[PDB]
Amino acid sequence: SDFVVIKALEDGVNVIGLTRGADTRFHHSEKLDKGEVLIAQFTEHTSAIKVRGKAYIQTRHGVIESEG
Amino acid sequence: SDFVVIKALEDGVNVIGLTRGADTRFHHSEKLDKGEVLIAQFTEHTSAIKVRGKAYIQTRHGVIESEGK
Amino acid sequence: SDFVVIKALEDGVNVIGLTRGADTRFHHSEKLDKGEVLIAQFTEHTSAIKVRGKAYIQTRHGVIESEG
Amino acid sequence: SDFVVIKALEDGVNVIGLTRGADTRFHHSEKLDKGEVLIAQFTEHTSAIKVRGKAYIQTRHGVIESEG
Amino acid sequence: SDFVVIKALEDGVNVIGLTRGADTRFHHSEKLDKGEVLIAQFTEHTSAIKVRGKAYIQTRHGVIESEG
Amino acid sequence: SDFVVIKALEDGVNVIGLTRGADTRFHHSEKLDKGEVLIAQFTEHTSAIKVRGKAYIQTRHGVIESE
Amino acid sequence: SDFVVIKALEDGVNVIGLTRGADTRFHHSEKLDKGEVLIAQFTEHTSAIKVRGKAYIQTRHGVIESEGK
Amino acid sequence: SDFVVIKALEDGVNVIGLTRGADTRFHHSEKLDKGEVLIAQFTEHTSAIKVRGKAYIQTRHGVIESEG
Amino acid sequence: NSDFVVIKALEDGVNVIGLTRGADTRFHHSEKLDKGEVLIAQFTEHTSAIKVRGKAYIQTRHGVIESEG
Amino acid sequence: NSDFVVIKALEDGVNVIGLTRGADTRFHHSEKLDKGEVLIAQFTEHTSAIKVRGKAYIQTRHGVIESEG
Amino acid sequence: SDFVVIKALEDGVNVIGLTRGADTRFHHSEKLDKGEVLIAQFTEHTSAIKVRGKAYIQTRHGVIESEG
Numbered sequence: 040s041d042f043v044v045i046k047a048l049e050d051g052v053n054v055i056g057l058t059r060g061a062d063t064r065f066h067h068s069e070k071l072d073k074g075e076v077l078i079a080q081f082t083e084h085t086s087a088i089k090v091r092g093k094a095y096i097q098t099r100h101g102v103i104e105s106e107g
Numbered sequence: 108s109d110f111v112v113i114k115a116l117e118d119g120v121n122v123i124g125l126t127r128g129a130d131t132r133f134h135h136s137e138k139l140d141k142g143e144v145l146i147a148q149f150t151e152h153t154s155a156i157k158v159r160g161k162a163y164i165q166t167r168h169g170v171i172e173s174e175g176k
Numbered sequence: 177s178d179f180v181v182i183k184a185l186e187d188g189v190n191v192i193g194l195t196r197g198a199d200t201r202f203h204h205s206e207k208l209d210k211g212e213v214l215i216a217q218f219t220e221h222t223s224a225i226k227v228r229g230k231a232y233i234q235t236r237h238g239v240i241e242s243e244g
Numbered sequence: 245s246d247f248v249v250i251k252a253l254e255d256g257v258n259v260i261g262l263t264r265g266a267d268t269r270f271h272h273s274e275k276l277d278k279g280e281v282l283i284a285q286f287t288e289h290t291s292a293i294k295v296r297g298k299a300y301i302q303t304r305h306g307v308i309e310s311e312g
Numbered sequence: 313s314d315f316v317v318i319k320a321l322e323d324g325v326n327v328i329g330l331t332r333g334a335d336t337r338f339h340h341s342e343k344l345d346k347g348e349v350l351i352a353q354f355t356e357h358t359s360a361i362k363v364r365g366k367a368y369i370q371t372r373h374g375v376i377e378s379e380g
Numbered sequence: 381s382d383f384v385v386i387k388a389l390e391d392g393v394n395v396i397g398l399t400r401g402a403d404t405r406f407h408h409s410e411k412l413d414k415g416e417v418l419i420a421q422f423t424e425h426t427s428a429i430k431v432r433g434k435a436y437i438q439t440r441h442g443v444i445e446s447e
Numbered sequence: 448s449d450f451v452v453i454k455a456l457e458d459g460v461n462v463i464g465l466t467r468g469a470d471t472r473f474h475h476s477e478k479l480d481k482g483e484v485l486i487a488q489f490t491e492h493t494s495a496i497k498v499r500g501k502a503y504i505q506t507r508h509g510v511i512e513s514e515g516k
Numbered sequence: 517s518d519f520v521v522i523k524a525l526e527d528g529v530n531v532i533g534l535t536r537g538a539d540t541r542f543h544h545s546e547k548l549d550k551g552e553v554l555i556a557q558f559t560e561h562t563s564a565i566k567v568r569g570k571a572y573i574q575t576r577h578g579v580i581e582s583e584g
Numbered sequence: 585n586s587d588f589v590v591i592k593a594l595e596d597g598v599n600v601i602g603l604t605r606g607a608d609t610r611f612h613h614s615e616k617l618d619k620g621e622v623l624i625a626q627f628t629e630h631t632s633a634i635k636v637r638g639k640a641y642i643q644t645r646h647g648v649i650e651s652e653g
Numbered sequence: 654n655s656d657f658v659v660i661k662a663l664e665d666g667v668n669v670i671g672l673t674r675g676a677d678t679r680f681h682h683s684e685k686l687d688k689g690e691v692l693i694a695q696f697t698e699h700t701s702a703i704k705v706r707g708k709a710y711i712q713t714r715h716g717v718i719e720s721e722g
Numbered sequence: 723s724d725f726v727v728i729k730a731l732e733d734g735v736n737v738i739g740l741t742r743g744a745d746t747r748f749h750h751s752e753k754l755d756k757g758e759v760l761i762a763q764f765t766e767h768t769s770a771i772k773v774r775g776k777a778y779i780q781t782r783h784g785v786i787e788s789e790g
């Protein structure tokens with residue numbers, strides 16, 4: 040099952056898990072300080088992940104960068 | 108299951124999930140502001156995804172760019 | 177399950193689902209205006225997809241372009 | 245399942261599905277006008293596909309061109 | 313399931329399905345005229361295919377040409 | 381399931397199927413004349429394939445030629 | 448199932464497992480001192496992993512580095 | 517299941533199937549005359565294959581030749 | 585059919601520590617390696633994370649990495 | 654569907670030995686190859702390790718290796 | 723299921739199978755003399771393998787050498 044890597048490029052990056060299912064809203068927000076890395080899967084409860092704030096992101100389709 | 112990456116290139120971008128099944132309609136519109144990235148799967152409930160607004164998009168088939176009205 | 181990416185290159189492009197099953201008829205026509213992108217799977221309900229109007233198309237077999 | 249991409253290079257191209265099963269006959273003929281694109285799977289009902297008319301075709305095996 | 317692509321390079325090319333099972337015989341022969349393409353799967357009923365007549369053939373193993 | 385492509389390079393080529401199972405014998409021989417192509421899977425009934433006569437063969441492991 | 452490799456580049460690096468399921472919380476924090484290596488899977492109990500502290504990280508998407516505190 | 521291609525480079529080559537199971541013995545020898553090709557799978561009944569005589573052999577791991 | 589890691593000890597007394605799979609996380613075994621020995625160790629029903637202490641050359645599916653003592 | 658090894662005897666009296674699968678490990682069969690004969694042998698429900706003695710050219714999915722008598 | 727290739731570079735190389743399960747101990751040691759090769763799988767009974775002595779080793783992750 041797929042995962043994304045998120046490296047925070049500043050304090051307070053917000054990695055937001057959206058609920059899997061007929062309804063969509065966020066069910067968890069994990070904040071990262073600058074330099075921290077989160078490696079997070081798609082799961083039974085999370086089917087979309089949003090990143091807010093400056094982050095360096097890797098997925099199976101390559102590198103992408105969120106800007107705050 | 109496959110996923111698409113969408114990075115908003117201006118405020119107010121909408122990533123719209125279309126319902127899976129005989130019926131086709133919008134069930135959710137996720138609004139993205141400039142700089143934010145959404146990584147969204149295809150799912151039991153979403154079998155097509157529409158992007159309105161300027162965005163940089165990656166899928167397994169490569170990069171594509173939506174342009175806003 | 178695979179999908180196809182369609183970017184509309186002018187207004188009023190139609191992405192048409194054809195029904196899976198013994199019967200083949202339309203079922204849904206999604207209208208894309210210029211610059212809009214639709215990323216659409218093959219599904220239990222849709223086993224063929226037609227594009228009408230000018231669009232840039234990506235599939236697992238590469239790029240192709242429809243013309244209006 | 246595998247799918248084929250067909251781009252009509254002239255009007256009145258026919259993409260014809262042959263029935264899966266002990267019997268082989270045409271169950272459906274999809275007419276494409278010049279410039280239209282049909283992306284069509286193999287399915288429970290369709291185990292062979294015939295293209296009549298000038299078209300550009302992609303399959304997992306690469307490009308091939310049908311001629312009028 | 314695998315498929316073979318056949319482009320007829322002359323009229324009257326025959327793409328012949330051989331029966332799956334203990335018995336081997338021809339259950340169907342599809343006639344292609346010049347420039348027609350047939351894309352044909354292996355199936356529950358067809359476990360070998362024979363092409364007779366001049367054609368350009370693609371499979372997973374590459375290109376081969378039959379001659380009349 | 382995998383397949384073999386055989387192109388006959390002369391008349392009279394035989395593509396022979398061998399029975400799956402505890403016992404091994406020929407259950408079918410398909411005759412190919414010059415230029416005809418057969419594409420043949422391994423199956424419930426055929427676990428080995430013999431080619432006799434001159435033909436160009438392709439498999440997943442590349443090209444080989446019978447004489 | 449996928450794994451990540453983490454090599455601590457200073458003392459006191461934490462490799463933190465987040466719970467799988469509807470509830471998300473830390474359920475374990477593995478402390479690495481400098482030069483130690485942990486190779487950790489995703490599991491029925493861990494669906495996300497956070498690294499805090501200076502570390503060299505390998506995943507199937509390649510090399511990433513966490514930067515300390 | 518994997519298969520092996522054996523092309524006999526002299527008469528009398530033997531392709532020998534060894535029994536699957538706790539017992540190991542030869543259950544069949546297929547004799548190949550010069551220039552014959554045999555394409556043979558691993559099966560419920562055959563878990564090792566021995567070749568005797570001069571032959572050009574292909575497997576998933578590349579070419580090897582046997583010599584008489 | 586799980587993944588495995590290759591650990592070659594570059595000095596005596598390297599420890600390859602298996603961590604328990606499941607809700608709880610603890611060391612269930614430390615295999616001690618002397619210099620020049622190679623351990624090839626899978627992830628398993630009982631081991632979902634592996635810690636290496638001491639100097640070792642390591643190979644996994646994501647490449648080479650080295651632990652330091 | 655299992656993996657297999659190709660063994661080409663480079664001298665007479667080469668032995669390809671099958672070791673039993675399961676809790677008990679012993680030799681259950683030894684196949685004698687004379688010079689230039691080839692054996693293509695799978696791992697099986699009965700054979701979970703294969704030993705080659707004598708001079709032979711061996712191909713696995715990991716590449717070529719050679720045994721020396 | 724994965725396997726390791728071990729080529730003894732001196733006499734008395736010991737290939738040691740460790741028990742799968744909650745407990746860890748060795749359940750078999752297979753000694754190799756110089757120039758013998760052992761191709762050993764991971765199995766229902768062996769989930770870790772230790773090599774002692776000078777040996778050339780291939781795994782899916784490449785070559786490694788043990789030193790005795």
Ligand SMILES: N[C@@H](Cc1c[nH]c2ccccc12)C(=O)O
Nearest residue numbers: 059060062063124147150152153
């Ligand atoms: N609840 C939605 C979340 C989602 C996933 N991908 C999407 C694409 C667009 C809009 C919403 C979504 C679902 O599981 O389908």
Ligand SMILES: N[C@@H](Cc1c[nH]c2ccccc12)C(=O)O
Nearest residue numbers: 127128130193216217219221222
């Ligand atoms: N409800 C439709 C959504 C859809 C997916 N792919 C399409 C292609 C064309 C039109 C509609 C669709 C379905 O699941 O089939």
Ligand SMILES: N[C@@H](Cc1c[nH]c2ccccc12)C(=O)O
Nearest residue numbers: 196197199200261284287289290
């Ligand atoms: N209803 C048809 C739709 C179809 C898919 N592929 C085709 C190719 C040709 C003609 C029709 C089709 C089916 O499910 O089989």
Ligand SMILES: N[C@@H](Cc1c[nH]c2ccccc12)C(=O)O
Nearest residue numbers: 264265267268291329352355358
């Ligand atoms: N009814 C036939 C259609 C077919 C598929 N591949 C073919 C090849 C040759 C002739 C017929 C066919 C079948 O399902 O098998």
Ligand SMILES: N[C@@H](Cc1c[nH]c2ccccc12)C(=O)O
Nearest residue numbers: 331332333335359397420423426
């Ligand atoms: N009825 C045969 C047809 C066949 C497939 N491949 C073959 C190779 C040789 C001879 C016959 C065949 C079968 O299903 O097995």
Ligand SMILES: N[C@@H](Cc1c[nH]c2ccccc12)C(=O)O
Nearest residue numbers: 399400401403427533559561562
């Ligand atoms: N009846 C044998 C045929 C066979 C397959 N592969 C072989 C290799 C060698 C000799 C015989 C065979 C079987 O199914 O096993």
Ligand SMILES: N[C@@H](Cc1c[nH]c2ccccc12)C(=O)O
Nearest residue numbers: 464487490492493605606608632
């Ligand atoms: N007992 C934990 C061990 C573990 C695996 N990967 C981890 C990542 C971080 C922290 C703990 C772990 C589990 O099976 O899930």
Ligand SMILES: N[C@@H](Cc1c[nH]c2ccccc12)C(=O)O
Nearest residue numbers: 056079082084085467468471494
């Ligand atoms: N409990 C959450 C943990 C998680 C995984 N991926 C995430 C992405 C964003 C936020 C939370 C998560 C889950 O298993 O789904």
Ligand SMILES: N[C@@H](Cc1c[nH]c2ccccc12)C(=O)O
Nearest residue numbers: 602625628630631742743745746
């Ligand atoms: N009995 C242990 C053996 C093992 C596998 N990999 C390990 C890594 C470290 C320590 C022990 C092991 C198990 O099956 O899990």
Ligand SMILES: N[C@@H](Cc1c[nH]c2ccccc12)C(=O)O
Nearest residue numbers: 536537539540563671697699700
């Ligand atoms: N009867 C043995 C035959 C065998 C397969 N591979 C081997 C390797 C060595 C010795 C014997 C064999 C088995 O099925 O397991």
Ligand SMILES: N[C@@H](Cc1c[nH]c2ccccc12)C(=O)O
Nearest residue numbers: 674675678701739762765767768
């Ligand atoms: N009977 C043992 C044989 C074995 C396979 N791989 C090994 C590695 C080392 C020692 C023994 C083995 C097993 O099935 O597990």
